[PDB]
Amino acid sequence: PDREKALELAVAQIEKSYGKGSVMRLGDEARQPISVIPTGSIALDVALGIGGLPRGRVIEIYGPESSGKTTVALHAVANAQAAGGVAAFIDAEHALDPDYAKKLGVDTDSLLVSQPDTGEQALEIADMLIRSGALDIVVIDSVAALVPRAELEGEHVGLQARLMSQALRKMTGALNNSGTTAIFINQLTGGKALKFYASVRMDVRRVETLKDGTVGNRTRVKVVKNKCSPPFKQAEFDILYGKGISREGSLIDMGVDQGLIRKSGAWFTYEGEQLGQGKENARNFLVENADVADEIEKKIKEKLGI
């Protein structure tokens, strides 16, 4: 009886002295913000709790080469722009494919891009850009490529981590004020600081190759760190070569997950209407009928926080 008070009281001190998400029960309902940046998959948006990536915060998306992290990052960029936001892409990797970015939603013409000479220049440019107040999102591709000036100039080893720590310390205050989201893409170094500064960390992986005959990959994302909603939630969704995340595919999956879409036979049905026989026909139905996809989306968001 008097214990529940003491705990609630303790949770409150922790909340006051360290911040809103400093302690959570894993069954807690998410703290719904005004605006977020959707990720392209409703499943991933739900796994994040707040319906997308938070604003004004450091975000890490990591995984193996071609795991899908950059695609997740580019959808964040597409969605941020679709809401009238400006985007930046700090590129020390030189891997970006704008044609891919166009197809999945990015306004590449509008995309600010910078190919910095050094690790510090990359982070400093990001900082100037953030402190402007004008950006909604900045992507850093990538953490590993942020090589320090001294290394590049040929002039001990360990200051790459000290560079990030110094940068993140200064950057984090700028992000909160501006409301800009910073996505750091990272591989499986210098991320030891990023691990603690990031409000969300996402572990992206290829789980299974999709197929017509012999197209894409089923992708799995675990939210290993989340200061905005209970962490350790995971999601799956499809990334189709040349197209990106199958938005419609995630609506079906979360559709059946939520009982809004019934899978009577190979047929997926919705509201008495039939969507298609098998997944691909249902997926295809929802892209041709954007109105019903929005209907299904609205219902899924309604039935949860999002």
CSV table of N, CA and C in Angstrom, one decimal, residues 32-187:
chain,number,residue,atom,x,y,z
A,32,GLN,N,3.4,10.4,-26.3
A,32,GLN,CA,3.1,10.8,-27.7
A,32,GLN,C,3.5,12.3,-28.0
A,33,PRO,N,4.5,12.6,-28.8
A,33,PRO,CA,4.8,14.0,-29.1
A,33,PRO,C,4.0,14.5,-30.2
A,34,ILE,N,4.1,15.9,-30.4
A,34,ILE,CA,3.3,16.6,-31.4
A,34,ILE,C,3.6,16.2,-32.8
A,35,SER,N,4.9,16.2,-33.1
A,35,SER,CA,5.4,15.8,-34.4
A,35,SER,C,6.6,14.8,-34.3
A,36,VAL,N,6.6,13.9,-35.2
A,36,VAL,CA,7.7,12.9,-35.3
A,36,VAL,C,8.0,12.8,-36.8
A,37,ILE,N,9.1,12.1,-37.1
A,37,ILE,CA,9.4,11.8,-38.5
A,37,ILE,C,9.2,10.3,-38.7
A,38,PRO,N,8.1,9.9,-39.4
A,38,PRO,CA,7.8,8.5,-39.8
A,38,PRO,C,9.0,7.9,-40.5
A,39,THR,N,9.1,6.6,-40.4
A,39,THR,CA,10.3,5.8,-40.9
A,39,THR,C,10.0,5.1,-42.2
A,40,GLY,N,8.8,5.0,-42.7
A,40,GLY,CA,8.4,4.3,-43.9
A,40,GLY,C,7.7,3.0,-43.7
A,41,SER,N,8.0,2.4,-42.5
A,41,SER,CA,7.3,1.2,-42.1
A,41,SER,C,6.4,1.5,-40.8
A,42,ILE,N,5.1,1.2,-40.9
A,42,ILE,CA,4.2,1.4,-39.8
A,42,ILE,C,4.7,0.5,-38.6
A,43,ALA,N,5.1,-0.7,-38.9
A,43,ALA,CA,5.6,-1.6,-37.9
A,43,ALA,C,6.8,-1.0,-37.1
A,44,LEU,N,7.8,-0.4,-37.8
A,44,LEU,CA,8.9,0.3,-37.2
A,44,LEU,C,8.4,1.5,-36.4
A,45,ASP,N,7.5,2.2,-37.0
A,45,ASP,CA,6.9,3.4,-36.3
A,45,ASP,C,6.3,3.0,-35.0
A,46,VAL,N,5.6,1.8,-35.0
A,46,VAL,CA,5.0,1.3,-33.8
A,46,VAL,C,6.0,0.8,-32.8
A,47,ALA,N,7.0,0.0,-33.3
A,47,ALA,CA,8.1,-0.4,-32.4
A,47,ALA,C,8.8,0.7,-31.7
A,48,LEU,N,8.9,1.9,-32.4
A,48,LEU,CA,9.4,3.1,-31.7
A,48,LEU,C,8.5,3.7,-30.7
A,49,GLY,N,7.2,3.3,-30.7
A,49,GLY,CA,6.3,3.8,-29.7
A,49,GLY,C,5.7,5.2,-30.1
A,50,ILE,N,6.5,6.1,-30.4
A,50,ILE,CA,6.0,7.5,-30.7
A,50,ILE,C,5.7,7.7,-32.2
A,51,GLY,N,5.6,6.6,-32.9
A,51,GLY,CA,5.1,6.7,-34.3
A,51,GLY,C,6.1,7.1,-35.4
A,52,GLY,N,7.4,7.2,-35.0
A,52,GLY,CA,8.4,7.6,-35.9
A,52,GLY,C,9.7,8.0,-35.1
A,53,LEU,N,10.6,8.6,-35.7
A,53,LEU,CA,11.8,9.1,-35.0
A,53,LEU,C,11.5,10.4,-34.3
A,54,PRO,N,12.1,10.6,-33.1
A,54,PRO,CA,11.9,11.9,-32.4
A,54,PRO,C,12.6,13.1,-33.0
A,55,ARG,N,12.1,14.3,-32.7
A,55,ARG,CA,12.7,15.5,-33.2
A,55,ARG,C,13.6,16.1,-32.2
A,56,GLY,N,14.7,16.8,-32.6
A,56,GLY,CA,15.6,17.4,-31.7
A,56,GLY,C,16.6,16.4,-31.0
A,57,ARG,N,16.8,15.3,-31.7
A,57,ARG,CA,17.6,14.2,-31.0
A,57,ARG,C,18.6,13.5,-31.9
A,58,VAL,N,19.5,12.9,-31.2
A,58,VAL,CA,20.5,12.1,-31.8
A,58,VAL,C,20.0,10.7,-32.0
A,59,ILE,N,20.2,10.1,-33.2
A,59,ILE,CA,19.7,8.8,-33.5
A,59,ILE,C,20.8,8.0,-34.2
A,60,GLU,N,21.0,6.8,-33.8
A,60,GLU,CA,21.9,5.9,-34.4
A,60,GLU,C,21.2,4.8,-35.1
A,61,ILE,N,21.5,4.5,-36.3
A,61,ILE,CA,21.0,3.4,-37.0
A,61,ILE,C,22.2,2.6,-37.5
A,62,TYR,N,22.4,1.3,-37.0
A,62,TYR,CA,23.6,0.5,-37.3
A,62,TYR,C,23.2,-0.9,-37.9
A,63,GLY,N,24.2,-1.5,-38.4
A,63,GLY,CA,24.1,-2.8,-39.0
A,63,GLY,C,25.2,-3.1,-40.0
A,64,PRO,N,25.2,-4.3,-40.6
A,64,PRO,CA,26.1,-4.7,-41.7
A,64,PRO,C,26.0,-3.9,-42.9
A,65,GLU,N,27.0,-4.1,-43.9
A,65,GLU,CA,26.9,-3.5,-45.2
A,65,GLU,C,25.6,-3.9,-45.9
A,66,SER,N,24.9,-3.0,-46.5
A,66,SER,CA,23.7,-3.3,-47.3
A,66,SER,C,22.6,-4.0,-46.4
A,67,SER,N,22.6,-3.7,-45.1
A,67,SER,CA,21.6,-4.2,-44.2
A,67,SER,C,20.2,-3.5,-44.3
A,68,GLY,N,20.2,-2.3,-44.8
A,68,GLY,CA,19.0,-1.5,-44.9
A,68,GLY,C,19.0,-0.2,-44.1
A,69,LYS,N,20.0,0.0,-43.3
A,69,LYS,CA,20.0,1.2,-42.5
A,69,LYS,C,19.9,2.5,-43.3
A,70,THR,N,20.7,2.6,-44.3
A,70,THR,CA,20.7,3.8,-45.2
A,70,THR,C,19.3,4.0,-45.7
A,71,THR,N,18.6,3.0,-46.2
A,71,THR,CA,17.3,3.1,-46.7
A,71,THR,C,16.3,3.6,-45.6
A,72,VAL,N,16.4,3.1,-44.4
A,72,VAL,CA,15.6,3.6,-43.3
A,72,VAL,C,15.9,5.1,-43.1
A,73,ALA,N,17.2,5.4,-43.2
A,73,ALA,CA,17.6,6.8,-43.0
A,73,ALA,C,17.1,7.7,-44.2
A,74,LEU,N,17.0,7.2,-45.4
A,74,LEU,CA,16.5,8.0,-46.5
A,74,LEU,C,15.0,8.2,-46.5
A,75,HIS,N,14.3,7.2,-46.0
A,75,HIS,CA,12.8,7.3,-45.7
A,75,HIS,C,12.5,8.4,-44.7
A,76,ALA,N,13.3,8.4,-43.6
A,76,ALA,CA,13.2,9.5,-42.7
A,76,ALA,C,13.4,10.9,-43.4
A,77,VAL,N,14.4,10.9,-44.3
A,77,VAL,CA,14.6,12.2,-45.1
A,77,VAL,C,13.4,12.5,-46.0
A,78,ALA,N,12.9,11.5,-46.7
A,78,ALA,CA,11.7,11.7,-47.6
A,78,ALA,C,10.5,12.2,-46.8
A,79,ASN,N,10.2,11.5,-45.6
A,79,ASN,CA,9.1,11.9,-44.8
A,79,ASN,C,9.2,13.3,-44.2
A,80,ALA,N,10.4,13.7,-43.8
A,80,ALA,CA,10.7,15.0,-43.2
A,80,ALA,C,10.5,16.1,-44.3
A,81,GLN,N,10.9,15.8,-45.5
A,81,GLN,CA,10.7,16.7,-46.6
A,81,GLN,C,9.2,16.8,-47.0
A,82,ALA,N,8.6,15.7,-47.1
A,82,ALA,CA,7.1,15.7,-47.4
A,82,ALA,C,6.3,16.5,-46.5
A,83,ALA,N,6.8,16.8,-45.3
A,83,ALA,CA,6.1,17.7,-44.4
A,83,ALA,C,6.6,19.1,-44.5
A,84,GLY,N,7.3,19.4,-45.5
A,84,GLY,CA,7.9,20.8,-45.7
A,84,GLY,C,9.2,21.1,-45.0
A,85,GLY,N,9.9,20.1,-44.6
A,85,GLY,CA,11.2,20.2,-44.0
A,85,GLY,C,12.4,20.2,-44.9
A,86,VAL,N,13.5,20.8,-44.5
A,86,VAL,CA,14.8,20.8,-45.2
A,86,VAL,C,15.7,19.7,-44.7
A,87,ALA,N,16.4,19.1,-45.5
A,87,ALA,CA,17.3,17.9,-45.2
A,87,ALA,C,18.7,18.1,-45.6
A,88,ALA,N,19.6,17.6,-44.8
A,88,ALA,CA,21.1,17.6,-45.1
A,88,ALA,C,21.6,16.2,-45.0
A,89,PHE,N,22.6,15.9,-45.8
A,89,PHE,CA,23.3,14.6,-45.9
A,89,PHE,C,24.8,14.8,-45.8
A,90,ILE,N,25.4,14.6,-44.7
A,90,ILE,CA,26.8,14.7,-44.5
A,90,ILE,C,27.5,13.4,-44.9
A,91,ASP,N,28.1,13.4,-46.1
A,91,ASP,CA,28.6,12.2,-46.7
A,91,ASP,C,30.2,12.1,-46.7
A,92,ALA,N,30.6,11.1,-45.9
A,92,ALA,CA,32.1,10.8,-45.8
A,92,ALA,C,32.2,9.4,-46.4
A,93,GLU,N,31.2,8.8,-47.0
A,93,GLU,CA,31.2,7.5,-47.5
A,93,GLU,C,31.2,7.4,-49.1
A,94,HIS,N,30.5,8.4,-49.7
A,94,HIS,CA,30.4,8.5,-51.2
A,94,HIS,C,29.7,7.3,-51.8
A,95,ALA,N,28.7,6.8,-51.1
A,95,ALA,CA,27.9,5.6,-51.6
A,95,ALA,C,26.5,6.0,-52.0
A,96,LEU,N,26.0,7.1,-51.6
A,96,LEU,CA,24.6,7.5,-51.9
A,96,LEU,C,24.3,7.4,-53.4
A,97,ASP,N,23.1,6.7,-53.6
A,97,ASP,CA,22.5,6.6,-54.9
A,97,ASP,C,21.2,7.5,-55.0
A,98,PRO,N,21.3,8.6,-55.7
A,98,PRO,CA,20.1,9.5,-55.7
A,98,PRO,C,18.9,9.0,-56.5
A,99,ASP,N,19.2,8.1,-57.5
A,99,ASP,CA,18.1,7.5,-58.2
A,99,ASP,C,17.2,6.6,-57.3
A,100,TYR,N,17.9,5.9,-56.5
A,100,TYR,CA,17.2,5.1,-55.4
A,100,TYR,C,16.5,6.0,-54.5
A,101,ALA,N,17.2,7.1,-54.1
A,101,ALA,CA,16.6,8.0,-53.2
A,101,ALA,C,15.3,8.7,-53.8
A,102,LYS,N,15.3,9.0,-55.1
A,102,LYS,CA,14.2,9.5,-55.7
A,102,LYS,C,13.0,8.6,-55.7
A,103,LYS,N,13.2,7.3,-56.1
A,103,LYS,CA,12.2,6.3,-56.2
A,103,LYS,C,11.4,6.1,-54.9
A,104,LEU,N,12.1,6.2,-53.7
A,104,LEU,CA,11.5,5.9,-52.5
A,104,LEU,C,10.9,7.1,-51.8
A,105,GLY,N,11.3,8.3,-52.3
A,105,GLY,CA,10.6,9.5,-51.9
A,105,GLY,C,11.4,10.8,-51.7
A,106,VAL,N,12.7,10.7,-51.7
A,106,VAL,CA,13.6,11.9,-51.4
A,106,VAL,C,13.5,12.9,-52.5
A,107,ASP,N,13.4,14.2,-52.1
A,107,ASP,CA,13.5,15.3,-53.0
A,107,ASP,C,15.0,15.6,-53.0
A,108,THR,N,15.7,14.9,-53.9
A,108,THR,CA,17.1,15.0,-54.0
A,108,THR,C,17.6,16.3,-54.5
A,109,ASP,N,16.9,17.0,-55.4
A,109,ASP,CA,17.2,18.3,-55.8
A,109,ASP,C,17.3,19.3,-54.6
A,110,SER,N,16.4,19.2,-53.7
A,110,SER,CA,16.4,20.0,-52.5
A,110,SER,C,17.4,19.6,-51.4
A,111,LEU,N,17.9,18.4,-51.5
A,111,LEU,CA,18.8,17.8,-50.5
A,111,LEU,C,20.1,18.5,-50.4
A,112,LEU,N,20.4,19.1,-49.3
A,112,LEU,CA,21.7,19.6,-49.0
A,112,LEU,C,22.7,18.5,-48.8
A,113,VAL,N,23.8,18.5,-49.4
A,113,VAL,CA,24.8,17.5,-49.4
A,113,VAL,C,26.2,18.2,-49.1
A,114,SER,N,27.0,17.5,-48.4
A,114,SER,CA,28.3,17.9,-48.1
A,114,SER,C,29.2,16.7,-48.0
A,115,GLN,N,30.4,16.8,-48.7
A,115,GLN,CA,31.4,15.7,-48.7
A,115,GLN,C,32.7,16.3,-48.0
A,116,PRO,N,32.7,16.2,-46.7
A,116,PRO,CA,33.7,16.9,-45.9
A,116,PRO,C,35.1,16.3,-46.0
A,117,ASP,N,36.1,17.2,-45.8
A,117,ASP,CA,37.5,16.8,-46.0
A,117,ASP,C,38.0,16.0,-44.8
A,118,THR,N,37.4,16.2,-43.6
A,118,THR,CA,37.8,15.5,-42.4
A,118,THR,C,36.7,15.2,-41.5
A,119,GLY,N,36.9,14.3,-40.5
A,119,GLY,CA,35.9,14.0,-39.5
A,119,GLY,C,35.4,15.3,-38.7
A,120,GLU,N,36.3,16.2,-38.3
A,120,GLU,CA,35.9,17.3,-37.6
A,120,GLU,C,35.1,18.3,-38.5
A,121,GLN,N,35.6,18.5,-39.7
A,121,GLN,CA,34.9,19.3,-40.7
A,121,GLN,C,33.4,18.8,-40.9
A,122,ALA,N,33.3,17.5,-41.0
A,122,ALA,CA,31.9,16.9,-41.1
A,122,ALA,C,31.0,17.3,-40.0
A,123,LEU,N,31.5,17.1,-38.7
A,123,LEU,CA,30.7,17.4,-37.5
A,123,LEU,C,30.5,18.9,-37.3
A,124,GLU,N,31.5,19.7,-37.6
A,124,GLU,CA,31.4,21.1,-37.5
A,124,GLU,C,30.4,21.7,-38.6
A,125,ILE,N,30.4,21.2,-39.8
A,125,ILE,CA,29.5,21.6,-40.8
A,125,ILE,C,28.0,21.2,-40.4
A,126,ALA,N,27.9,20.0,-39.9
A,126,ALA,CA,26.6,19.5,-39.3
A,126,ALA,C,26.1,20.5,-38.3
A,127,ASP,N,27.0,20.9,-37.4
A,127,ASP,CA,26.7,21.8,-36.3
A,127,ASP,C,26.2,23.2,-36.8
A,128,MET,N,27.0,23.8,-37.7
A,128,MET,CA,26.6,25.1,-38.3
A,128,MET,C,25.2,25.0,-38.9
A,129,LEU,N,25.0,23.9,-39.6
A,129,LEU,CA,23.7,23.6,-40.3
A,129,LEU,C,22.6,23.4,-39.3
A,130,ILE,N,22.8,22.7,-38.2
A,130,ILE,CA,21.8,22.6,-37.1
A,130,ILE,C,21.5,23.9,-36.4
A,131,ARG,N,22.5,24.6,-36.0
A,131,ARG,CA,22.3,25.9,-35.2
A,131,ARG,C,21.6,26.9,-36.0
A,132,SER,N,21.6,26.8,-37.4
A,132,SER,CA,20.7,27.6,-38.2
A,132,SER,C,19.3,27.7,-37.8
A,133,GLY,N,18.8,26.6,-37.3
A,133,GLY,CA,17.3,26.5,-37.0
A,133,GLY,C,16.5,26.0,-38.1
A,134,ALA,N,17.1,26.0,-39.3
A,134,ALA,CA,16.4,25.8,-40.6
A,134,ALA,C,16.2,24.3,-41.0
A,135,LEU,N,17.0,23.4,-40.4
A,135,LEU,CA,16.9,22.0,-40.8
A,135,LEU,C,16.0,21.2,-39.9
A,136,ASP,N,15.3,20.2,-40.6
A,136,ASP,CA,14.5,19.3,-39.8
A,136,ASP,C,15.3,18.0,-39.6
A,137,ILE,N,16.2,17.6,-40.5
A,137,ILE,CA,16.9,16.4,-40.3
A,137,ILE,C,18.3,16.5,-41.0
A,138,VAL,N,19.3,15.9,-40.4
A,138,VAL,CA,20.6,15.8,-41.0
A,138,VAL,C,21.1,14.3,-40.8
A,139,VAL,N,21.5,13.7,-41.9
A,139,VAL,CA,22.0,12.4,-41.9
A,139,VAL,C,23.5,12.4,-42.0
A,140,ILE,N,24.2,11.6,-41.1
A,140,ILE,CA,25.7,11.5,-41.2
A,140,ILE,C,26.0,10.1,-41.7
A,141,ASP,N,26.5,10.0,-42.9
A,141,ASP,CA,27.0,8.7,-43.5
A,141,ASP,C,28.5,8.8,-43.7
A,142,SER,N,29.3,8.3,-42.8
A,142,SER,CA,29.0,7.5,-41.7
A,142,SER,C,30.0,7.7,-40.5
A,143,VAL,N,29.7,7.1,-39.4
A,143,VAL,CA,30.5,7.2,-38.2
A,143,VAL,C,31.9,6.8,-38.4
A,144,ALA,N,32.1,5.6,-39.0
A,144,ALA,CA,33.4,5.0,-39.3
A,144,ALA,C,34.2,5.9,-40.2
A,145,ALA,N,33.6,6.5,-41.2
A,145,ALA,CA,34.4,7.4,-42.1
A,145,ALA,C,34.8,8.8,-41.5
A,146,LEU,N,34.4,9.1,-40.3
A,146,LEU,CA,34.7,10.4,-39.7
A,146,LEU,C,36.2,10.3,-39.2
A,147,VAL,N,37.1,10.3,-40.2
A,147,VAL,CA,38.5,10.1,-39.9
A,147,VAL,C,39.1,11.5,-39.5
A,148,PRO,N,39.9,11.5,-38.3
A,148,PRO,CA,40.4,12.8,-37.8
A,148,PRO,C,41.5,13.4,-38.7
A,149,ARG,N,41.5,14.7,-38.7
A,149,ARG,CA,42.5,15.5,-39.5
A,149,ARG,C,43.9,15.0,-39.3
A,150,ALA,N,44.3,14.8,-38.1
A,150,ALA,CA,45.7,14.4,-37.8
A,150,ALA,C,46.0,13.1,-38.5
A,151,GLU,N,45.1,12.1,-38.5
A,151,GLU,CA,45.3,10.9,-39.2
A,151,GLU,C,45.5,11.1,-40.7
A,152,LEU,N,44.6,11.9,-41.3
A,152,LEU,CA,44.6,12.2,-42.7
A,152,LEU,C,45.8,13.0,-43.1
A,153,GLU,N,46.3,13.8,-42.2
A,153,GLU,CA,47.5,14.6,-42.5
A,153,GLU,C,48.8,13.9,-42.2
A,154,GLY,N,48.7,12.7,-41.6
A,154,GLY,CA,49.8,11.8,-41.4
A,154,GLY,C,50.5,12.0,-40.0
A,155,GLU,N,50.1,13.0,-39.3
A,155,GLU,CA,50.6,13.2,-37.9
A,155,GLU,C,50.0,12.2,-37.0
A,156,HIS,N,48.0,10.5,-30.2
A,156,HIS,CA,48.1,9.2,-30.8
A,156,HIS,C,46.8,8.6,-31.1
A,157,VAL,N,46.7,7.3,-31.5
A,157,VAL,CA,45.5,6.7,-32.0
A,157,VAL,C,44.5,6.5,-30.8
A,158,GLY,N,43.2,7.0,-31.0
A,158,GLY,CA,42.2,7.1,-29.9
A,158,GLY,C,41.4,8.3,-29.9
A,159,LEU,N,41.9,9.4,-30.6
A,159,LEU,CA,41.2,10.7,-30.7
A,159,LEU,C,40.0,10.7,-31.6
A,160,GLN,N,39.7,9.7,-32.4
A,160,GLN,CA,38.5,9.6,-33.2
A,160,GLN,C,37.3,9.5,-32.3
A,161,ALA,N,37.4,8.7,-31.2
A,161,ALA,CA,36.4,8.6,-30.2
A,161,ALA,C,36.3,10.0,-29.4
A,162,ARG,N,37.4,10.6,-29.1
A,162,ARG,CA,37.5,11.9,-28.4
A,162,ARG,C,36.8,13.0,-29.3
A,163,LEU,N,37.0,12.8,-30.6
A,163,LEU,CA,36.4,13.8,-31.5
A,163,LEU,C,34.8,13.7,-31.5
A,164,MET,N,34.3,12.5,-31.5
A,164,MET,CA,32.8,12.3,-31.4
A,164,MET,C,32.3,12.8,-30.1
A,165,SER,N,32.9,12.4,-29.0
A,165,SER,CA,32.5,12.8,-27.7
A,165,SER,C,32.4,14.4,-27.6
A,166,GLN,N,33.4,15.0,-28.0
A,166,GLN,CA,33.5,16.5,-28.1
A,166,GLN,C,32.4,17.1,-28.9
A,167,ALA,N,32.2,16.5,-30.1
A,167,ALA,CA,31.2,16.9,-31.1
A,167,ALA,C,29.8,16.7,-30.5
A,168,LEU,N,29.5,15.5,-30.0
A,168,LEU,CA,28.2,15.2,-29.5
A,168,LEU,C,27.8,16.1,-28.3
A,169,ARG,N,28.7,16.3,-27.4
A,169,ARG,CA,28.5,17.2,-26.3
A,169,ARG,C,27.9,18.5,-26.8
A,170,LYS,N,28.6,19.1,-27.7
A,170,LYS,CA,28.2,20.4,-28.3
A,170,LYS,C,26.9,20.3,-29.2
A,171,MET,N,26.8,19.2,-29.9
A,171,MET,CA,25.8,19.1,-30.9
A,171,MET,C,24.4,18.8,-30.2
A,172,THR,N,24.4,18.1,-29.1
A,172,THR,CA,23.2,17.6,-28.5
A,172,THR,C,22.3,18.8,-28.0
A,173,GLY,N,23.0,19.9,-27.5
A,173,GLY,CA,22.3,21.1,-27.0
A,173,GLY,C,21.7,21.8,-28.2
A,174,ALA,N,22.4,21.9,-29.3
A,174,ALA,CA,21.9,22.5,-30.5
A,174,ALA,C,20.7,21.8,-31.1
A,175,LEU,N,20.7,20.5,-31.1
A,175,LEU,CA,19.6,19.7,-31.6
A,175,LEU,C,18.3,19.9,-30.8
A,176,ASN,N,18.4,19.9,-29.5
A,176,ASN,CA,17.2,20.1,-28.6
A,176,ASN,C,16.6,21.4,-28.9
A,177,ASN,N,17.4,22.5,-28.9
A,177,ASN,CA,16.8,23.9,-29.2
A,177,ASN,C,16.2,24.0,-30.6
A,178,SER,N,16.9,23.5,-31.6
A,178,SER,CA,16.4,23.6,-33.0
A,178,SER,C,15.3,22.6,-33.3
A,179,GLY,N,15.2,21.5,-32.7
A,179,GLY,CA,14.2,20.5,-33.0
A,179,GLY,C,14.6,19.6,-34.2
A,180,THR,N,15.9,19.7,-34.6
A,180,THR,CA,16.4,19.0,-35.8
A,180,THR,C,16.8,17.6,-35.3
A,181,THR,N,16.5,16.6,-36.1
A,181,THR,CA,16.9,15.2,-35.9
A,181,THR,C,18.2,14.9,-36.6
A,182,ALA,N,19.2,14.3,-35.8
A,182,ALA,CA,20.4,13.9,-36.4
A,182,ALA,C,20.5,12.4,-36.4
A,183,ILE,N,20.6,11.8,-37.6
A,183,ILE,CA,20.8,10.4,-37.8
A,183,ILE,C,22.2,10.1,-38.1
A,184,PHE,N,22.9,9.3,-37.2
A,184,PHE,CA,24.2,8.8,-37.5
A,184,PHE,C,24.1,7.4,-37.9
A,185,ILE,N,24.6,7.1,-39.2
A,185,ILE,CA,24.7,5.8,-39.6
A,185,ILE,C,26.0,5.2,-39.2
A,186,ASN,N,26.0,3.9,-38.8
A,186,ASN,CA,27.2,3.3,-38.2
A,186,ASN,C,27.3,1.8,-38.6
A,187,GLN,N,28.5,1.3,-38.7
A,187,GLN,CA,28.7,-0.1,-39.1
A,187,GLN,C,29.0,-1.0,-37.8
